[PDB]
């Protein structure tokens, strides 16, 4: 937004927004650009760290380049990139507040020996000083590591506040699961942390909580994380430390709040209103103190993740180096990334791999040496540490849970007010405002350990080859003992089986043969990788990943991993089973000063102790939950990551196999040039289909393993808690009974009632909530991912704005819509429907998915009402190019669904009787895994066919809705990337159908004051007619064929003039036009008759059956309306409850 855009690396020094300033007290100088008040960008490498460092000091996962950001071209690209990111952050209210706060957050000034500011940059000549809170540099030595440093440690810890330097890397990002890290949130993290430095609230380096149990190591060792980073970094982890009530504290919090008030006070009494100071400072201060210290502690990435709809890693996100090997991708501004973030979002952005990936330093935490019986090395695998500092030592054992207790954080930031504070111009500099910057040096220790039993990291490593030629094998021992060594380890049974079945076959020559091959390759991969089996466990039914044991070598010694896991339980999957440490408590003593109190006071004082206690219980439980997360979940998340890596390794093998075959045919075969062309385009789509299938599998292992971890809490941790708690309340119960007996000033009847009031039982501490356990893993990110990856490729919406008709796509995909300007909208079934006139009107939807291919599945559905005239075959909707793809046609009285591949194979299927000028729900389902086509009309399944004979349907990326020659209505058009089942169709159809509206015979909304004819469900072609008997007139139907009774004309009336459409439960008056207007009444015989006087008219309740879409029911005083027995012969309309259910269904036809 209004971040300063006017800068380039060649911008001249103006001494206002572009300066050349000294770095701390060094001899070194650098150029800085002011992008916002008090906020500068210095587009070079951080000055404080040497660019070339000794090999011994290079950290794992680091990339070291001394010539990076050396050139002017690079520097500008940097400067623009940061400016771009700050613009994105400022373009959303949340991040706009963050920047505004940071801007006004200037550190507290020192006093006379008038006031001296510590936040400024010095000109080289040291006669000019520029206000700065924040300065953003490029990386230090390691060019993938962001950093946030303080100008002066003392001022960062003492409540004054200190300037903050940031080291940032806009040009590289990595993939985590299905998404790219968004540098915008990575920068927001650095910015949030600076808040701690600007306020002078930086905690001791020693204030540190347990993060991850290092379950990789033979010994007991924890990784720790400073409170600052935990609170800022977001994700799930913090939910365990930050709790209500708090089980974890430190003087830091209470003291920070204390000093903050001291400084606020110094401001209030002295600085504010002091004319010796000036607004650019005191006004900013006033805003800095509108905040509460708590607001900063409560502020973190999870909040911006949500406000910006940015995906971020949500679990152990400061330990990722251990769980993951990062692969870096280049980001170019603004081609890849702009003020709206990644072009095409974090999932589908097209980013190039960095050539730097090969320069990444690899320094394992430990190395797993796998030998054989002869003590010779088969394999050496790497395990990487998280980077965090460790122990020392065990926190849970020595931590006492305190018995005595002593959303939005940016709400109080005012953007308008802050933006009107003149910039700080005359600065009176405080001389020593900074520390000599001292670079951190780190030597990385590596452990070698030997095993005759393959670890998961071994089985993983065996799933990679650099061999251009390789063979899949299911024997791990054979793979690593290979005399080839061409073998690579694979669990894909269906794929390996298929590859073997075709081993002896004549080579692939036709394109048709390539497709048949590629398709079977795809189906089998899907079957292998998405395999799950539901099992009964201690805690329930879990959907188990079938190949898990064969992948990681876990419970793999059986012939089946699944049954062995059902047997041994969730805890059998991890290496360290007993990590718990019973926490140290605060022992229970009731004061000796209450011994003589009177009842009322004794009473209400034990009530206080009762609450403190039950709160204390809750704290203990929390402590157990944190240990679970740290000690146990950490190990299941390791399993999740390794399992996910296994899936990628396998996927890679598959793609390489496919790529080789395609590459080979293109290399030497007689296949036509443009057939090869199609093959190339098509295979690409198949490779996407393979990732989508891989993704389903990576979700499978996430649910499976998360459930397991939760089962371990119920089955293993929780019961240890319950043990500890009944020892605890057994004790408390004792001491409280002994206390009450020793009470002097109360009687014996009082003692018994009191002991009873104050006694604890197990229910007081049974806190397990399984739904809460499960909800832990639903983060903003998990949700965002769901919405980005759901099956909708097109969801058509339409509505009427004043003077405008709106049509759009809600799928959240890339769909582009182009349509005739004059297309009209009309209310359909549940919403506004598009009207196509058949002549000039058309609409078209564009999505790369729409082209289909060989291997993808999809569903098309929509509501359609056709004013049916001609029988002649006419395009309605379809996607076709080069005579491939699919089309739905109007033909005869029906539709035709057509499907045709590049080899000429066709589906041409007539769907009878769809143009009655009544709404119909069309569902078409194409399933390549089951090779099955399904076509539904309304609630019926009209076609079920094999499509094994249809191969490559690649079409354009455009679906065209033409509706040639047949004016029609189309509503709720949807495209899905998955097949549809019959349950889903029924659910879609009926759910949409009950919106409270009653419908006419055509399923259009029933209207008041509109003329209809009335028909009973049982005789559907016979309209109600009027007949007089004794000088008065009744309602019947015509069973004497052409007795020339005239169809009677009906109109529904409402007590409310403003009411237009008829709804479920409405009160109604039925009228008829004969000579005058006649209104319906009930006789004493319960036979309906037309009368003279609206006053006497009976008010009836109209309603409908949920499963009968075009029909309605009518009742009076609970008595429903139906057709009588034969009489005259005539069948009278009667109010009676004893007839067959079918006779109570009516419909109005206009």
């Amino acid at each position: 937004m209004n971040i300063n855009d006017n800068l380039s690396i060649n911008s001249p020094v103006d001494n206002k927004n572009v300066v050349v300033v000294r770095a701390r007290k060094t001899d070194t100088v650098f150029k800085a650009f002011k992008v916002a008040p008090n906020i500068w960008v210095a587009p070079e490498r951080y000055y404080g760290e040497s660019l070339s460092i000794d090999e011994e000091y290079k950290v794992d996962g680091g990339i070291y380049d001394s010539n990076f950001l050396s050139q002017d071209s690079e520097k500008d690209k940097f400067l623009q990139a940061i400016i771009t990111l700050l613009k994105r952050i400022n373009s959303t209210n949340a991040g706009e507040k963050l920047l505004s706060l940071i801007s006004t957050a200037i550190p507290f000034p020192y006093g006379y020996i008038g006031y001296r500011e510590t936040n400024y940059l010095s000109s080289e000549d040291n006669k000019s000083f520029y206000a700065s809170n924040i300065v953003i540099f490029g990386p230090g030595a390691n060019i993938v590591e962001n950093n946030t440093v303080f100008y002066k440690k003392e001022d960062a810890e003492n409540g004054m506040g200190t300037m903050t330097e940031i080291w940032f890397q806009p040009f590289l990002t990595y993939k985590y699961d299905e998404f790219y890290i968004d540098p915008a949130i990575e920068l927001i993290k650095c910015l949030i942390k600076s808040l701690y430095f600007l306020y002078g609230i930086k905690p001791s380096d020693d204030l540190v909580i347990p993060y991850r149990l290092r379950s990789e190591l033979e010994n007991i060792e924890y990784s720790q994380l400073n409170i600052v980073d935990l609170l800022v970094s977001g994700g799930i982890d913090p939910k365990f430390i930050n709790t209500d009530p708090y089980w974890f504290t430190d003087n830091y919090f209470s003291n920070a709040k204390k000093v903050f008030e001291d400084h606020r006070n110094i401001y209030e009494t002295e600085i504010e209103g002091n004319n010796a100071i000036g607004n650019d400072i005191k006004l900013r201060l006033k805003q800095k103190f509108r905040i509460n210290i708590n607001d900063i502690w409560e502020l973190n990435l999870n909040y911006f993740s949500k406000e910006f709809s940015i995906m971020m890693p949500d679990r152990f996100n400061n330990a990722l180096k251990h769980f993951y090997r990062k692969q870096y991708y280049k980001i170019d501004y603004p081609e890849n990334y702009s003020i709206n973030g990644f072009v095409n979002g974090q999932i589908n952005a097209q980013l190039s791999l960095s050539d730097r990936n090969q320069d990444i330093i690899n320094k394992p935490e430990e190395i797993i040496n796998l030998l054989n019986g002869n003590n010779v090395s088969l394999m050496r695998s790497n395990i990487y540490g998280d980077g965090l500092k460790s122990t020392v030592d065990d926190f849970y054992s020595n931590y006492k849970i305190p018995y005595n207790r002593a959303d939005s954080s940016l709400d109080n930031v005012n953007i308008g007010v802050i933006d009107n504070i003149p910039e700080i111009i005359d600065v009176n500099p405080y001389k020593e405002n900074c520390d000599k910057f001292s670079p951190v040096q780190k030597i990385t220790s590596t452990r070698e350990i030997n095993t005759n039993i393959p670890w998961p990291i071994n089985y993983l490593q065996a799933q990679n080859t650099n061999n251009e030629k390789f063979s899949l094998s299911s024997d791990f021992v054979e793979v690593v003992s290979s005399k080839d060594k061409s073998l690579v380890y694979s669990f894909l049974s269906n794929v390996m089986f298929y590859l073997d079945s075709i081993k002896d076959n004549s080579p692939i020559d036709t394109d048709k043969k390539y497709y048949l091959w590629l398709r079977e390759i795809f189906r089998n991969y899907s079957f292998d990788i998405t395999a799950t089996q539901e099992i009964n466990t201690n805690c329930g039914i879990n959907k188990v990943v079938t190949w898990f044991g064969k992948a990681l070598n876990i419970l793999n010694t059986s012939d089946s991993f699944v049954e062995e896991f059902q047997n041994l339980g969730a805890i059998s999957l991890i290496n360290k089973k007993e990590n718990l440490s019973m926490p140290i408590i605060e022992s229970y003593e009731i004061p000796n000063d209450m011994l003589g109190l009177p009842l009322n006071d004794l009473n209400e004082k034990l009530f206080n102790i009762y609450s403190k206690n039950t709160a204390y219980f809750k704290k203990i439980y929390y402590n157990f939950l944190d240990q679970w997360w740290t000690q146990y979940y950490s190990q299941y998340f390791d399993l999740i990551c390794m399992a996910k890596r296994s899936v990628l390794a396998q996927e890679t093998l598959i793609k390489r196999i496919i790529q080789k075959k395609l590459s080979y045919l293109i290399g030497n075969s007689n296949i036509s040039s443009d057939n090869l062309a199609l093959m190339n385009l098509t295979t690409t789509n198949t490779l996407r289909d393979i990732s989508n299938e891989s993704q389903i599998a990576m979700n499978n292992v996430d649910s499976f393993l998360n459930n397991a971890a939760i089962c371990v809490f119920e089955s293993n941790i929780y019961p240890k808690f319950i043990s500890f708690m009944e020892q605890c309340i057994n004790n408390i119960n004792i001491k409280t009974k002994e206390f009450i007996q020793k009470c002097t000033n109360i009687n014996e009847d009082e003692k018994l009632q009191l002991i009873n009031q104050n006694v604890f039982n197990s229910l007081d501490f049974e806190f397990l909530n399984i739904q809460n356990m499960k909800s832990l893993f639903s983060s903003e990110t998990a949700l965002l991912i769901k919405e980005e990856t759901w099956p909708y490729e097109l969801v058509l919406y339409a509505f009427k704005e004043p003077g405008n008709n709106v049509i759009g796509d809600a799928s959240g995909k890339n769909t582009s819509i182009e349509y005739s300007k004059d297309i009209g909208l009309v209310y359909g079934i549940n919403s506004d429907a598009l009207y196509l006139n058949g002549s000039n009107q058309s609409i078209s939807f564009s999505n790369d998915f729409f082209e289909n291919g060989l291997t993808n599945s999809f569903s098309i559905y929509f509501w359609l009402r056709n004013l049916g005239k001609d029988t002649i075959k006419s395009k309605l909707i379809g996607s076709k190019e080069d005579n491939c793809g699919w089309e739905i046609y109007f033909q005869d009285t029906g539709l035709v669904f057509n499907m045709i591949d590049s080899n000429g194979n066709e589906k041409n299927i007539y769907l009878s009787d769809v143009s009655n000028n009544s709404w119909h729900y069309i569902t078409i389902s194409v399933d390549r895994l089951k090779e099955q086509l399904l076509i539904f009309i309304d609630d019926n399944l009209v076609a079920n066919e094999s499509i094994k004979e249809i191969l490559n349907i690649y079409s354009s990326n455009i679906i065209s809705l033409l509706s040639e020659n047949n004016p029609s209505y189309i509503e709720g058009l949807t495209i899905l990337n998955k097949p549809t089942t019959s349950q889903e169709v029924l659910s879609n159809y009926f759910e949409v159908l009950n919106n409270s509206y009653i419908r006419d015979s055509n399923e259009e909304r029933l209207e008041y004051n509109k003329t209809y004819q009335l028909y009973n469900y049982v005789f559907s072609d016979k309209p109600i007619c009027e007949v007089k008997q004794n000088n008065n007139i009744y309602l019947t139907i015509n069973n004497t064929n052409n007795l020339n009774l005239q169809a009677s004309k009906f109109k529904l009336l409402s007590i409310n003039p403003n009411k237009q459409y008829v709804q479920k439960l409405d009160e109604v008056i039925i009228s008829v036009l004969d000579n005058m207007e006649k209104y319906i009444d009930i006789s004493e015989d319960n036979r309906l008759q037309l009368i003279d006087n609206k006053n006497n008219a009976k008010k009836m309740i109209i309603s409908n059956d949920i499963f009968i879409s075009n029909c309605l029911t009518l009742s009076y005083n609970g008595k429903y309306i139906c057709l009588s027995m034969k009489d005259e012969n005539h069948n009278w309309m009667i109010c009676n409850n004893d007839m067959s259910k079918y006779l109570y269904l009516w419909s109005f036809k206009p």
């Binding site: 949500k306 953007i415 308008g416 949700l783 965002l784 969801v795 919406y797 709106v806 809600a810």
Partner: protein
């Protein structure tokens, strides 16, 4: 739909067709979803 929008630092109740362009449940956080709280004997603070 009736919802709210930030104008300066004020959150003003708004009718905005931007909602009608959205699919149903999106996140858990809508801005156009409301609750109607009647005075009830079961809660009973002082109005």
């Amino acid at each position: 739909f009736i919802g709210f929008h930030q104008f300066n630092n004020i959150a003003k109740l708004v009718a905005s067709n931007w909602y009608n362009r959205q699919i149903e449940r999106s996140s858990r956080t809508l801005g156009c979803s409301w609750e109607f709280i009647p005075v009830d004997d079961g809660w009973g603070e002082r109005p």
